[PDB]
Write a protein that binds this ligand. Structure first.
Ligand code: CLA
Ligand code: CLA
Ligand code: CLA
Ligand code: CLA
Ligand code: CLA
Ligand code: CLA
Ligand code: CLA
Ligand code: CLA
Ligand SMILES: CCCCCCCCCCCCCCCC(=O)OC[C@H](COP(=O)(O)OC[C@@H](O)CO)OC(=O)CCCCCCCCCCCCCCC
Ligand SMILES: CC(C)=CCC/C(C)=C/CC/C(C)=C/CC/C(C)=C/CC1=C(C)C(=O)c2ccccc2C1=O
Ligand SMILES: CC(C)=CCC/C(C)=C\CC/C(C)=C\CC/C(C)=C/CC1=C(C)C(=O)c2ccccc2C1=O
Lengths: 151, 62, 203, 772, 133, 80
């Protein structure tokens, strides 16, 4: 057992990140002249480690994310969090909009496209409608209209 | 209760408990225990959409 | 009780099903939820004890950097934990090098794989297959000369629906535990058996 | 009596029915109310007998669906030729078939997946490289005379035209000119045309391709002409045909030798060699041409056996009615009525044969390699054997399924009165109980030997083992058969056959360890294409494992057929159908008593069967056959290489298969643990997709056990609490969520079990042999 | 009456039919015709009274279902035969079919409540009494 | 022998009686429904417990209930 007092520092200070960063750039310059089209070319790899330079790295040299809510690492989890909840909330609200306007079960196996695009467009701004339905209790059915089992 | 009215189910073992069905038939006779026939939007686990209830198991919501 | 079976308490804790009606009702009893959760308990404790063992053999073996690098993806668990530490175990007996002290764990490790896999037969192939098979064996015994003189006192029947689940769970569980115990003991006792445990206090 | 009865435009070609899925069956036409309807739609869509009772309308749907399937296969074949033409290193592989790995799938560079394009496929025309292919398509295309990629592109276009022809005829013979029921029942005319026309003239026309394309192209490549310079029409010029084949295409003229019955001139390009050519490791093309000419003659002859419209020929119904005896009652009477009124009876036979033939293809292709240089492509050899083993096993299980469907749907007591079918049913308890006994015998006396050996080795008693180094179990009958076939070319029973497969020549050796280079067939890359295959104790033991797994699979499928209609348990089982989950928890419990559930259980045992076969093939070929030869010592270095068995300790040298496969720990350590090192280390390179597929297939296999081990009553109750939360927030759907049916939960489980298990071995095999 | 024409099978009677009980099904046939045995296989019924010995009551009732659905033969009778030789008629019991209501039958198994008004299992604890009483 | 109970929700549709492969069930006259009849289970010593009767019963939650009890030769469905 060996205590790690400093598990994380800036990646640009870690020498195992400088190992990796030069080892990736050398592979990107190897494929630029006398090479093959790759996902990370020489300018793509420069920008990749331009982003990782001000990140936190462990001793292996790989970036580690901080998800505690701290705001110098808000791009690590907090900003992808708002982007997720907007897009996932849009798809959830759009299905809820389409379900209420459904003619029947045939609208569930044959998608009514101008109804579906409109619900998917109206779902895009879902917190314009959802939170005024969320404080009113309009988001939920009363308890004596929802089936339950014996107790 | 009469034919056509929307009614809630108080039969707890019913699939449609606390749901709203439509009265399709009320038996005009005595001696019949469960005289009111209710039709529903949801089939149960057997694909059945109707059942018979007493008036004591129904709540008129209309 | 539930919506599928509102009077389930009248049938008790352990019963097979309520038949193929209402869509089909296999594994509806509260006993069957016990049976399903034993798999999930065995899986969870498996994850817990895999994690304890790999973190500690990386400490004992001076390979913590390998644990920190390879535990973040599932191939690292397969290769660096399961595949690498199986080597002294499955070499416990061999045509080239004879046997050593790990031969009993090597044999138990295979035994546990066999018992666990035998559980799958009970868990997958259910009763009505076996009952029709037993009726042909009952026919064969009664028609075979010198053997039909011997008669059972109790009529052979296939195991009940609940019994097939219990016996299948028992083989699955025993095979689960014996395999891991053979692996845990033989990998530790061969590759990482002893260490100092003295330390210098910190100030 | 053989006429053509056709109704004209019986079905209008309209898209009105596309607005209503599930129109074809009376339960589904009422629309979805639950999610069970969705699965019911797919499971019933090709079950044409549930859609109508009209046998003629069922026969019309089948005939038209067959055209659609043929169009699918031709589109698939068109894609293979297209990817060979435009996305391959076929041009560079043709110059160096032994130095370059074939690749015909290249990968776009996003997310870093271009790591799957590898060097050792990189060459000119194929700069970025690609996935190494193991289908053997380049060896097949080179064998039948493809030299350039521009010829593959024309073949891709031709296959799309054949596909569009096939798809049009399916529209035509359903919507425009649909044949009547008596047209389909002309089985004597159908057999005449398929034997003489399809199989006979198909082989005769292929002989003409072999003679005029495949033979002269190979004559030009053997002359040293580069394949870009190879004239493909050289077999159509009689003069250029003269220089390669001086006797058959000579001054003693070609077609002049044919009509004067001077066929001895044709021994230049039609031979009876038998063996493999030592330079390519493949069969002689003149042997292949004479083969297809000889079987064309026999098939065209066979297609004149049955009577159609000219008096002569056999009547199948009168033939079947004559072949009866005292021991078998009325004999084959009524089987003509079975086989001309049941599509399932014909499908059961034709799946049994197609699956069994595909397995014969697997054995015959490794041992008698038809394609030059393919015998040294070990990943191709492994893949082609394994693929056709799996295809054959799946089709045999389907034969058991449709035999059972025949028994439920199309069996009639009036047709089968004391005939062969009726008499099999009347002793089904005798058949199944004897099959129960022989599987128990085989399982004890084959797998128990492995367990004996595991235990003896662990106890430190290797002299008590069943092994070549210990108590031997020699497979003396198979060694006898090998001795017969080794002696037969040139010998008394085949005097003018010049050779046979080299696998037979094991006379003359007592192990694969003591193999010299003169006995093996190595090519110019010094790699062994094929060798004598020694059969010892380990091959005795594994062959009785094969017999165990086949007999259990037979036991399950035959129990499903013979008890499809009734049992002592369920006397009216046929009224419940082919596919029902159970008859309730009574009679002790009747789960999985249906004939469908025997197909379900039989798939796992087929899986167990084919998994042992391909594992046996992989280890035995690596240990005893494949490898390299050294031009010093005449030494054969197999891929694995010769365990020393201690035993005394005076060490005994055996091949690794003979020394180690005789117990389960050897299979676990020396086969599964040792050879998985390629796939678990494949990350960061081009085989890393196999490492991902290896992990992902393990996942899918494990995921299947959720379905196999549980029951739907749990899941339906769990769905109830979840539907409550969707009900509570106005997100409940109108199509009510149901748990999968009991049968579907079994079908989902076995599909994911098979998919995960087979794809694991696929990733294991291909990473093993493409890395070494 | 006589046995239907059948060459015998392995799916018929076992030693239970000698020591415990077997079953007899009797039906009249107007035409000689072929039917499927519940044991497995095809047999021919005579033009007369047919008697057939079967192992279970369910096998007898399955043949009766086949005789009704396929051949329109209605008047089938099922007897339970004891090893001493006693026959007891078990089907049909009162001559009237079970599906048709008949004045004269006693109601058996009647519980005068809907199924969700059964008492709790804690109510019937430490007794052989069940909650379906 | 299994217990086959009939509850007062029976509508007299006779579908359980037709479903039963053992002739356990029959219709007796009643006054509690419009059909004037109710299923009865006089011959439950022949009941195998297959629950085909419960499958045929249309009433929400069912008017006929099979409780699997002590197993006999008859109720286990043994031909031996
Ligand atoms: C486990 C419970 C927990 C929860 C619910 C939170 C929640 C939060 N923390 Mg975090 N935090 C935690 C544990 C937790 N923290 C721990 C254990 C540490 C020590 C590593 C931190 C260190 C930390 C910092 C340095 C900061 C936060 C901040 C925040 C806020 C994020 C701002 C936003 O809403 O977007 C959010 C309230 C940010 C804030 O501004 O708080 C108001 C911020 O700057 N946290
Ligand atoms: C209209 C779409 C929709 C919405 C708004 C919801 C909402 C919810 N689901 Mg449900 N669910 C859905 C579809 C939806 N679901 C579908 C199609 C399935 C079958 C796969 C499920 C299966 C399911 C389970 C098993 C559970 C939930 C749960 C929940 C709740 C918690 C969030 C969650 O766990 O999501 C998880 C979502 C899924 C697993 C399904 C997502 C699959 C796709 C993305 C949804 C389909 C989108 C639809 C086609 C869009 C059409 C719109 C267009 C026509 C305009 C939340 C109320 C949980 C709960 O009960 O919490 C209290 C829970 O345990 N859902
Ligand atoms: C039937 C089997 C089959 C299979 C599995 C493939 C598979 C593939 N084709 Mg091929 N192809 C086929 C038949 C097939 N093809 C046929 C019949 C033709 C016409 C002759 C082609 C003509 C063709 C061309 C011109 C190209 C491909 C390409 C591809 C690759 C990328 C898929 C893609 O671009 O989709 C796009 C995604 C969708 C359509 C999503 C829906 C993929 C390996 C591409 C390739 O190989 O890139 C280098 C490519 O450029 N195919
Ligand atoms: C040219 C367009 C066309 C149109 C408008 C119709 C219209 C119809 N067909 Mg016909 N048919 C066609 C072409 C067409 N067909 C072709 C090309 C074939 C040969 C395969 C057939 C063979 C055929 C049969 C055997 C039957 C019909 C039936 C029908 C009727 C109902 C079909 C339905 O609702 O299922 C909806 C189906 C789909 C939307 C398509 C399913 C496609 C699956 C998923 C894949 C199929 C692969 C395909 C065949 C091959 C592609 C090869 C390659 C090029 C990719 C409807 C009148 C049915 C009928 O009339 O019953 C009385 C019926 O039984 N058709
Ligand atoms: C010499 C003439 C000839 C030839 C070359 C064929 C060839 C074929 N027929 Mg056959 N057929 C013929 C005459 C012929 N038929 C005659 C005269 C009849 C009537 C007795 C049939 C009745 C028939 C049926 C019912 C079917 C075939 C089918 C087939 C195909 C089999 C699948 C395959 O191997 O590819 C194949 C294309 C199958 C097929 O795939 O149809 C599209 C099929 O289902 N044929
Ligand atoms: C259906 C298949 C088929 C077809 C279309 C052909 C077509 C041809 N053959 Mg071939 N051939 C075939 C099968 C076929 N053959 C078979 C099975 C044999 C073995 C008996 C031969 C043995 C053969 C000889 C010996 C010769 C031909 C020749 C020819 C060419 C005729 C030249 C001419 O005089 O006008 C013509 C291209 C003649 C030729 O000119 O070759 C270039 C010629 O001499 N053929
Ligand atoms: C020439 C070959 C052939 C033909 C024409 C048929 C035809 C038929 N079969 Mg048979 N059968 C076959 C071979 C064949 N089968 C084989 C090889 C097997 C063994 C597996 C079977 C076993 C079998 C059973 C057990 C049953 C049938 C049934 C049927 C009938 C209905 C099919 C249907 O609608 O299902 C609909 C088809 C689907 C819903 C698609 C199937 C999808 C499979 C299960 C999984 C595919 C996954 C794929 C391999 C990998 C994808 C992974 C990727 C996407 C990630 C139809 C008569 C059924 C019947 O009742 O007959 C009356 C039936 O129960 N067959
Ligand atoms: C490794 C796990 C395992 C084992 C040991 C078995 C064993 C067996 N299966 Mg099972 N099966 C399995 C997995 C397994 N199965 C799974 C996963 C399924 C789900 C699909 C099935 C479903 C299934 C079906 C549908 C059938 C079988 C049958 C059999 C028997 C085959 C005959 C035989 O080999 O007798 C020899 C016995 C053995 C090989 C077992 C162990 C004995 C060895 C030699 C050691 C001896 C120890 C000694 C006695 C100790 C004292 C055998 C008892 C068949 C049967 O019952 O036919 C008779 C049959 O029809 N199984
Ligand atoms: C193998 C035996 C052998 O080949 O016998 C073949 C024997 C042939 O009997 P027959 O002379 O009745 O054959 C007429 C044939 O046309 C079959 O109907 O068939 C049997 O006796 C029935 C099979 C019982 C075999 C059970 C094993
Ligand atoms: C306890 C005692 C007195 C022993 C005396 C000494 C004696 C005779 C030892 C012998 C014990 C044994 C091995 C009895 C055979 C067990 C059997 C009927 C297995 C078939 C069977 C299988 C394989 C399933 O998968 C399955 C799944 C779900 C439900 C039912 C079944 C089922 O039935
Ligand atoms: C294009 C596309 C993919 C759209 C998404 C499609 C949409 C909208 C929903 C998707 C629903 C799907 C695809 C699956 C859920 C199936 C399900 C209820 C599983 C639970 C279940 C489990 C886990 C068992 O083990 C089992 C065992 C034996 C019997 C029954 C069961 C059983 O029922």
């Amino acid at each position: 057992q060996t205590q790690v007092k400093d598990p994380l520092k800036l990646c640009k200070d870690v020498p195992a990140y400088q190992e990796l960063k030069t080892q990736r750039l050398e592979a990107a310059q190897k494929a630029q002249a006398d090479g093959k089209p790759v996902t990370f070319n020489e300018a793509g790899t420069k920008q990749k480690f331009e982003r990782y330079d001000t990140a936190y790295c462990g001793q292996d040299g790989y970036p580690h994310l901080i998800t505690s809510g701290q705001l110098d690492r808000a791009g690590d989890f907090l900003i992808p969090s708002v982007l997720f909840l907007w897009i996932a909330g849009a798809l959830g609200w759009a299905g809820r909009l389409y379900l209420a306007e459904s003619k029947g079960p045939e609208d569930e196996i044959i998608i009514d496209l101008p109804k579906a695009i409109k619900c998917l467009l109206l779902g895009l701004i879902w917190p314009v409608q959802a939170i005024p339905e969320l404080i009113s209790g309009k988001i939920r059915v009363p308890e004596d209209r929802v089936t339950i089992s014996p107790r | 209760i009469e034919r056509g009215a929307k009614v809630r189910i108080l039969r707890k073992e019913s699939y449609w408990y606390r749901e709203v069905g439509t009265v399709a038939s009320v038996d005009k006779s005595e001696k019949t225990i469960y005289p009111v026939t209710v039709r529903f939007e949801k089939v149960n686990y057997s694909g059945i959409n109707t059942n018979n209830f007493g008036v004591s198991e129904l709540e008129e919501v209309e | 009780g539930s919506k599928l079976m509102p009077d389930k308490k009248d049938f008790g804790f352990a019963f097979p099903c309520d038949g193929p009606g209402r869509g089909g009702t296999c594994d509806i009893s509260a006993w069957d939820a016990f049976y399903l959760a034993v798999f999930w308990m065995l899986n969870t404790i498996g994850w817990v004890t895999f994690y304890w063992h790999w973190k500690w053999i990386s400490i004992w073996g001076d390979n913590v950097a390998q644990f920190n690098a390879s535990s973040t993806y599932l191939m690292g668990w397969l290769r660096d934990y399961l595949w690498a530490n199986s080597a002294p175990l499955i070499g416990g007996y061999s045509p080239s090098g004879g046997t050593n002290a790990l031969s009993v764990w090597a044999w138990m490790f295979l035994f546990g794989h066999l018992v666990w896999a035998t559980g799958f037969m009970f868990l997958i192939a259910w009763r009505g297959y076996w009952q029709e098979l037993i009726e042909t064996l009952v026919w064969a015994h009664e028609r075979t000369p010198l053997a039909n003189l011997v008669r059972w006192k109790d009529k052979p029947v296939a195991m009940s629906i609940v019994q097939g689940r219990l016996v299948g769970l028992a083989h699955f569980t025993i095979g689960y535990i014996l395999t891991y115990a053979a692996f845990l003991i033989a990998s530790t006792a061969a590759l990482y058996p002893n260490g100092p445990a003295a330390f210098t206090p910190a100030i | 009596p053989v006429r053509v009865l056709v109704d004209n435009d019986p079905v209008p070609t309209s898209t009105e029915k596309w607005g209503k899925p599930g129109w074809f069956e009376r339960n589904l036409a009422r629309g979805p109310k639950t999610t069970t309807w969705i699965w019911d739609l797919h499971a019933l869509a090709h079950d044409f007998e549930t859609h109508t009772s009209d046998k003629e309308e069922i026969s019309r749907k089948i005939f038209s669906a067959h055209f659609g399937h043929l169009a699918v296969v031709c589109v698939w074949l068109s894609g293979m030729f297209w990817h060979g033409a435009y996305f391959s290193n076929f041009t560079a592989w043709m110059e160096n078939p032994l130095g370059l790995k074939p690749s015909a799938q290249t990968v776009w560079p996003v997310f870093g997946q271009e790591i799957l394009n590898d060097p050792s496929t990189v060459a000119k025309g194929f700069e970025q490289g690609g996935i190494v292919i193991t289908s053997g398509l380049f060896h097949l295309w080179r064998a039948v005379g493809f030299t350039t990629t521009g010829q593959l592109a024309a073949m891709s276009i031709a296959m799309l035209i054949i596909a569009a022809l096939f798809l049009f005829a399916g529209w035509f013979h359903y919507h425009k000119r649909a044949p009547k029921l008596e047209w389909f029942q002309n089985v004597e005319s159908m057999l005449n045309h398929h034997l003489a026309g399809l199989f006979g003239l198909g082989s005769l026309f292929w002989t003409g391709h072999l003679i005029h394309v495949a033979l002269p192209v190979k004559a030009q490549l053997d002359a040293g002409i580069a394949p870009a310079q190879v004239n493909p029409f050289a077999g159509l010029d009689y003069g250029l045909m003269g220089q390669y084949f001086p006797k058959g295409f000579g001054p003693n003229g070609g077609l002049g030798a044919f009509f004067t019955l001077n066929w001895g001139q044709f021994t230049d390009f039609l031979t009876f060699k038998g063996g493999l050519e030592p330079a390519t490791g493949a069969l002689y093309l003149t042997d292949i041409a004479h083969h297809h000419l000889a079987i064309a003659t026999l098939f065209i002859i066979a297609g004149h056996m049955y009577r159609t419209n000219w008096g002569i020929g056999h009547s199948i119904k009168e033939m079947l009615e004559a072949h009866k005896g005292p021991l078998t009652g009325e004999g084959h009477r009524g089987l003509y009525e079975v086989l001309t009124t049941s599509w399932h009876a014909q499908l059961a036979i034709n799946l049994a044969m197609a699956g069994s033939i595909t397995i014969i293809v697997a054995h015959h292709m490794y041992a008698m390699n038809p394609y030059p240089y393919m015998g040294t492509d070990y990943a191709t050899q492994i893949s082609l054997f394994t693929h056709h083993m799996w295809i054959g096993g799946f089709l045999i299980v389907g034969a058991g399924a449709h035999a059972a469907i025949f028994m439920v749907r199309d069996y009639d007591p009036v047709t089968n009165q004391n005939n062969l079918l009726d008499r099999v049913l009347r002793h089904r308890d005798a058949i199944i109980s004897h099959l129960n006994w022989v599987t128990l015998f085989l399982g004890f006396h084959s797998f128990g030997l492995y367990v004996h050996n595991d235990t003896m080795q662990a106890l430190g008693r290797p002299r008590d083992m069943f092994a070549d180094f210990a108590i031997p179990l020699q497979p003396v009958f198979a060694q006898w058969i090998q001795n017969i076939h080794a002696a037969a070319p040139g010998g008394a029973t085949a005097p003018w056959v010049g050779g046979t497969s080299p696998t037979w020549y094991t006379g003359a050796l007592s192990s694969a360890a003591t193999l010299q280079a003169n006995q093996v067939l190595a090519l110019a890359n010094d790699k062994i294409s094929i060798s004598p295959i020694h059969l010892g104790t380990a091959d005795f033991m594994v062959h009785h494992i094969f017999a165990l797994c086949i007999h259990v699979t037979v036991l399950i499928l035959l129990k499903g057929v013979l008890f499809a209609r009734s049992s002592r348990l369920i006397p009216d089982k046929a009224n419940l159908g082919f596919r029902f989950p159970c008859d309730g928890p009574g009679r002790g419990g009747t789960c999985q008593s249906s004939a469908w559930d025997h197909v379900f259980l039989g798939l796992f045992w087929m899986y167990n069967t084919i998994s042992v076969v391909i594992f046996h093939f992989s280890w035995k070929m690596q240990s005893d056959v494949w490898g390299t030869v050294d031009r010093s010592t005449g030494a054969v270095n197999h891929i694995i290489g010769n365990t020393d068995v201690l035993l005394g300790g005076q060490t005994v040298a055996l091949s690794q298969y003979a020394a180690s496969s005789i117990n389960i720990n050897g299979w676990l350590r020396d086969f599964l643990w040792a050879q998985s090192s390629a796939v678990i280390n494949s990350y960061g390179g081009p085989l890393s997709a196999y490492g991902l597929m290896f992990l992902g297939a393990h996942f899918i296999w494990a995921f299947s056990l959720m379905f196999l081990f549980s029951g739907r009553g749990y899941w339906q109750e769990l769905i109830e609490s979840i539907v409550w939360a969707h009900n509570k927030l106005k997100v409940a759907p109108a199509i009510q969520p149901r748990a999968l049916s009991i049968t579907q939960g079994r079908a989902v489980g076995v599909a994911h079990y098979l998919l995960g298990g087979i794809a694991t071995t696929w990733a294991f095999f291909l990473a093993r042999f493409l890395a070494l | 009456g006589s046995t239907p024409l059948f060459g015998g099978s392995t799916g018929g009677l076992l030693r239970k039919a000698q020591i415990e009980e077997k079953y007899l099904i009797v039906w009249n046939s107007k035409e000689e015709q072929v039917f499927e045995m519940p044991t497995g296989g095809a047999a021919t019924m005579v033009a007369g009274t047919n008697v057939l010995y079967l192992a279970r009551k369910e096998q007898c009732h399955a043949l009766h279902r086949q005789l009704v659905s396929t051949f329109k033969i209605r008047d089938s009778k099922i007897y339970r035969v004891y090893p001493n030789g006693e026959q007891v008629l078990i089907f049909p019991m009162d001559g009237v079919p079970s599906e048709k209501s008949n004045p004269g039958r006693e109601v058996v198994g009647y519980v005068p409540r809907k199924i969700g008004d059964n008492p709790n299992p804690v109510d019937v604890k430490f007794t052989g009494k069940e909650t379906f009483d | 022998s299994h217990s086959v109970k009939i509850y007062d929700t029976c509508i007299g549709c006779t579908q359980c009686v037709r479903a039963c492969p053992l002739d356990v069930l029959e219709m007796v006259p009643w006054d509690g429904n419009k059909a004037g009849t109710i299923a009865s289970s006089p011959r439950t010593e022949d009941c195998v417990g297959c629950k085909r009767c419960e499958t045929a019963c249309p009433t929400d939650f069912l008017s006929i209930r099979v409780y699997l009890g002590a197993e006999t030769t008859r109720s286990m469905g043994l031909a031996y």
